[PDB]
Design a protein around this ligand. Sequence first.
Ligand code: TYM
Ligand code: A1EHN
Lengths: 326, 334
Amino acid sequence: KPIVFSGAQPSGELTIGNYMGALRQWVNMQDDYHCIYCIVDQHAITVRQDAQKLRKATLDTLALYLACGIDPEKSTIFVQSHVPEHAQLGWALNCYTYFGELSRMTQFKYAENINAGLFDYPVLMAADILLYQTNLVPVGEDQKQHLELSRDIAQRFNALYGEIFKVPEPFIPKSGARVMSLLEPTKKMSKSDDNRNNVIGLLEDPKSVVKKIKRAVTDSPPVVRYDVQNKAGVSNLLDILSAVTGQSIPELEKQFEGKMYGHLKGEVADAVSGMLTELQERYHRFRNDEAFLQQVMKDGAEKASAHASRTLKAVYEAIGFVAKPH
Amino acid sequence: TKPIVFSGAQPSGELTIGNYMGALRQWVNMQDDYHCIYCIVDQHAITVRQDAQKLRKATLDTLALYLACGIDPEKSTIFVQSHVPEHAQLGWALNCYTYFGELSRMTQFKDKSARYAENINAGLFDYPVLMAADILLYQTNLVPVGEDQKQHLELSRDIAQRFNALYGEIFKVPEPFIPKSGARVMSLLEPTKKMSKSDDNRNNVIGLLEDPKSVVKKIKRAVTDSDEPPVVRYDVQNKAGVSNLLDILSAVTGQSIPELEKQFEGKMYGHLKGEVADAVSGMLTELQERYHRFRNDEAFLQQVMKDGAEKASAHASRTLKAVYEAIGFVAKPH
Ligand SMILES: Nc1ncnc2c1ncn2[C@@H]1O[C@H](COP(=O)(O)OC(=O)[C@@H](N)Cc2c[nH]c3ccccc23)[C@@H](O)[C@H]1O
Ligand SMILES: CC1(C)c2c[nH]c3cccc(c23)S[C@H]1C(=O)O
């Protein structure tokens, strides 16, 4: 059964696109794969930010992932800094990563505020993956180059020392749910959009959801019908609704037979907020139970440590370090 | 508590008399005056590709060489860098408080780039940050190094102050301790070039483990100036070779440069190099006898590593906990 590794940014403000696409997809496959979720607080500090905000966003991310259905009895979920092997393999893999490889990274694309954490975080990301003998990494478009570096480092290291690492593969199949930006239905709804009226975050209240749905773009008589060319905005709203409800697009078209665009946005907001209401309720239950979150964090980090230490011990043996006396 | 000293040497290549006069001599001399912590920085060594078997054997060589020079494990903490995970952890975090320009300006990164153009790796680039992490973990007051580490040491003071100004008095700002004499021991056949472990011209280099008979031959052929008449006078600019030999003689005997200038009044360079060779031969002969007694007792080397890494970890983990609290990390549950 394959090992799957995902990193979760504590600063990431997740959206209904993330939840109904990737997260829903992976929540349903936790018995099919050995899923590992790593909240990457070591990657976060490559962007200077308030310390207390970062502490809180780490705990918010953990509760939010648990709210969405990550089950820590099935999956391994942990905080990156709680497992020292990441930094250790991160340093070691530096020595096997070309300087040019890092400088040709587009996500790194100065000498006045580029801290070296921003420059070197692809190697840390490689270390995150290789520690766990990872077979599959679900990567978005802007993470494809980073995944390729990981495979390049792993095969380079393996060529010198043997099958120490598994070469990770991208996880190819996409969720299927189609969620696009509210004001730009040519672009996909993205958690990292600076324009937040483009997205519906998971913790938003029904009154806020009504506001952003109500300002979702539309077209001319008017008719509710799926056409990603002529009626892209209307198509996105049918896609979100179908994503929330499970109704087919042809079914939804007959539901909105003779109804107008306001009733569609009203039905979309009602369904999205309904979904977000049970999600938020679970999120607050987990988020206010400090003993619970401590227990998940402790359990997951120990599960993760067992695998990471095995790998790092193999790396150190191969490289030629004297083993730490036991 | 006494002020704290920290310093490191790589288990790569063979240590030279430059390593002795620039660092190890001062390490030994400081063990009583301060609380001294000495590291074998194997994570720094792999920035230059090593044969794995050699790296492991070289690590135990370096430890025995520390012991043979008088580093005393009952007085100093001695440990191998990779046995203390906190070095890597703080190394990562301090990358975020180091600018890219500071690292691309580094002379060591430029020189090592030209020497190892087939392996210009990111560890070579990031080298100063892990070095800073080594130093700042132990609340270090003093770092005894040769002249060639001075730029590295200044970055770690700058990273220390930068972090502290954000977060409070988390790190001590360290200070260099660089010797007045013997901080940049020069090459024997080329005294305008520093003596380097990695020199292809091995007649330039005095190795601490080299056969004394071969060291004597090399010293007697050291190049000297063409003053007429020849005078044994200390002048590093205009008398590079002669001054380098005086530096080396003084590191073996403990006599001052002026007490050596008087000793060699009315003396010529042949006599000078013969005395240097004789004194260097004797010191290496006694060092190598101690070295073999320590080196062949690998169970004693293992015990030193175990006790040292445990002593190091108690300090390093205390600093790292404070760094993690300050930057905003959720603390690992107990
Ligand atoms: N010709 C010379 N004359 C005088 N001194 C010399 C000469 N050649 C070398 N040295 C000094 O020897 C020490 C060890 O050198 P390394 O190359 O192992 O040195 C190095 O590679 C360090 N980066 C190891 C290190 C890693 N982390 C640290 C933290 C604190 C202090 C030191 C370290 C150094 O003090 C070096 O200046
Ligand atoms: C930064 C990030 C969260 C990350 C760190 N380490 C990883 C290992 C596998 C996949 C990923 C990651 S995704 C990546 C992203 O940019 O989203």
